[PDB]
């Protein structure tokens, strides 16, 4: 590079109806030639306000841009929960053209705990050699949750990993896996398989299990 | 469930040496083989040594025979790797996996989480 | 309308060539009112500009100085496309490459067409396809997926009912396992009621290998 962009705030949460600006500032004067990008998960970022203040076709009327010079400005007038996003500031005033680190806005909402679900290995993986336990934790928010594993009613370390999924586009809400991995004989040698689930919006921990073979 | 954590791993030097540990968690390694496996980015993940059950032997791969010994503690859950002689082309994250199969086909379940070598 | 269609094998060995295509539909890789651009991201580094090709009178290229020595932006008018080749590649060119088109005109210079994206893996590592399990509904609403295992490079993408289920699914991203493979899941929630009759089937796909497999999930 050269211009540098720099985005504040990195990130925030704020609430559907809120009206949000985010500000993008270039290291040096780049005068009209800033351009506002919208990257939801999956997906190439989507040009929203070009030229500062000029709205793309297509985008929706409740975003808008300002600005000039060094200090630039995005809002959306109205939150709603599909702008969940990473918003991308760029100049194009002078080669190398250069982007902002983004920010990550989240949808701010009401408290849900998860539904929870347990999942045995298949018939068909188990044949192949391997166990995998499946732990699913659905449609809850805010993010944070923790995830036992409790094999024969003992607790469970090493063995297990996680993935999140990205906020949700019209629930606003988050799904969580997590994933128990044994060997076959290993899968073998135990009977009770559990999974224990805690979350800000449970008043005590939530526990789905099963008898292996059941 | 099996836990393989690895450790010694570091800097060193060309011409260099380290011992790495593997200790094993939850199941006996005896009856078992183990094996050494190395990574470094952009590379696969390259086979290094084996050490079968007792009296079944260790065998190596091309690129570390007569600098690199695997060998075996049973009592202590423990396996080690011996890296002499050590070069920059050494350098990798090394990982050591349990052989899942008494029949030592490689069925490699569990992995242990990796130590850093780096010889410069 | 005009629409970016991106091409290219999304693994490249270390030292090796990256190339890449991106053929245009709607629009002319000579048009004076536009620039062809790509463009990388990767979580590490954000989004950087590579360069550009464009066509005033002559054709010429913009390249960003950290690839310049090893990049390469031609176009192709006989096939309305243009392309991307990044020479003696290394874990850091390791990131997803978006190919674009620059409007550049009075009012606006700017990337208002984007390509899908091609995620790029630098690995001397082989492909290899995943293996598709069931993760069947339990014995109101009831949860169902399919646990996708064991693939590279990234990635894989899922669909139900070939497109016709969409709400309720949740697809995780990959995990990169204890063993340098990716996994993930998929998963939908539907009525419990509608278990004994209704057909839920994911559809897999891993371009990478060559793969795509359907799997129905039952009780």
């Known amino acids: 590079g050269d211009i540098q962009m720099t985005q504040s705030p990195s990130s925030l949460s704020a609430s559907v109806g809120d009206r949000v600006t985010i500000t993008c500032r270039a290291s040096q004067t780049i005068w009209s030639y800033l351009n506002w990008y919208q990257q939801r998960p999956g997906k190439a970022p989507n040009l929203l306000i070009y030229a500062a203040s000029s709205l793309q076709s297509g985008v929706p009327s409740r975003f808008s841009g300002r600005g000039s010079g060094t200090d630039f400005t995005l809002t959306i007038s109205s939150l709603q929960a599909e702008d969940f996003a990473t918003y991308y500031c760029q100049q194009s005033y002078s080669i190398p053209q250069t982007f902002g680190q983004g920010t990550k806005l989240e949808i701010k909402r009401t408290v849900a705990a998860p539904s929870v679900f347990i999942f045995p290995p298949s018939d068909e993986q188990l044949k192949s050699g391997t166990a995998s336990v499946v732990c699913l934790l659905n449609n809850f928010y805010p993010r944070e949750a923790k995830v036992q594993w409790k094999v024969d009613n003992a607790l469970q370390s090493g063995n297990s990993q996680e993935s999140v999924t990205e906020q949700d586009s019209k629930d606003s809400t988050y799904s969580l896996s997590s994933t128990l991995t044994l060997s076959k004989a290993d899968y073998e040698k135990h009977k009770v398989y559990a999974c224990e689930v805690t979350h800000q919006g449970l008043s005590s921990p939530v526990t789905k299990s099963f008898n292996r073979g059941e | 469930x099996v836990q393989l954590x690895x450790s010694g791993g570091g800097x060193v030097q060309x011409g260099x040496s380290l011992x790495l540990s593997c200790x094993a968690x939850x199941x006996x390694x005896x009856x078992x083989x183990x094996x050494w496996x190395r990574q470094x980015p952009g590379x696969x993940r390259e086979x290094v040594x084996x050490x079968x059950x007792x009296x079944x032997x260790x065998x190596x791969x091309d690129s570390x025979x007569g600098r690199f010994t695997x060998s075996x503690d049973x009592x202590x859950x423990x396996x080690x790797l011996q890296x002499x002689x050590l070069x920059x082309x050494d350098x990798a994250x090394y990982y050591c996996x349990x052989x899942x199969x008494x029949x030592x086909x490689x069925x490699x379940x569990x992995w242990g989480x990796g130590t850093x070598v780096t010889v410069s | 309308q005009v629409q970016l269609q991106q091409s290219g094998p999304g693994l490249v060995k270390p030292s090796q060539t990256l190339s890449l295509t991106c053929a245009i539909s709607?629009?002319?890789?000579?048009?004076?009112?536009?620039?062809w651009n790509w463009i990388r991201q990767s979580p590490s580094r954000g989004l950087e500009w590579l360069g550009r090709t464009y066509y005033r009178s002559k054709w010429y290229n913009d390249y960003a100085v950290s690839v310049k020595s090893r990049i390469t932006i031609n176009p192709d008018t006989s096939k309305n496309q243009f392309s991307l080749q990044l020479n003696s590649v290394t874990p850091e060119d390791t990131a997803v490459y978006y190919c674009?088109?620059?409007?550049?005109?009075?009012?606006?210079?700017?990337?208002?067409?984007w390509g899908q994206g091609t995620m790029v893996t630098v690995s001397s590592a082989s492909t290899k396809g995943p293996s598709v399990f069931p993760l069947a509904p339990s014995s109101g609403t009831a949860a169902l997926g399919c646990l996708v295992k064991d693939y590279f490079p990234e990635p894989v993408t899922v669909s139900w009912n070939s497109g016709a289920l969409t709400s309720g699914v949740h697809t995780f991203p990959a995990v990169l396992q204890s063993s340098g493979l990716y996994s993930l899941s998929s998963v939908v929630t539907v009525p419990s009621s509608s278990l004994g009759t209704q057909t839920y089937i994911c559809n897999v796909s891993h371009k990478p290998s060559n793969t795509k497999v359907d799997k129905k999930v039952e009780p």
């Open positions: 709607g629009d002319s890789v000579s048009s004076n009112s536009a620039a």
């Open positions: 674009a088109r620059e409007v550049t005109g009075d009012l606006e210079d700017a990337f208002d067409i």
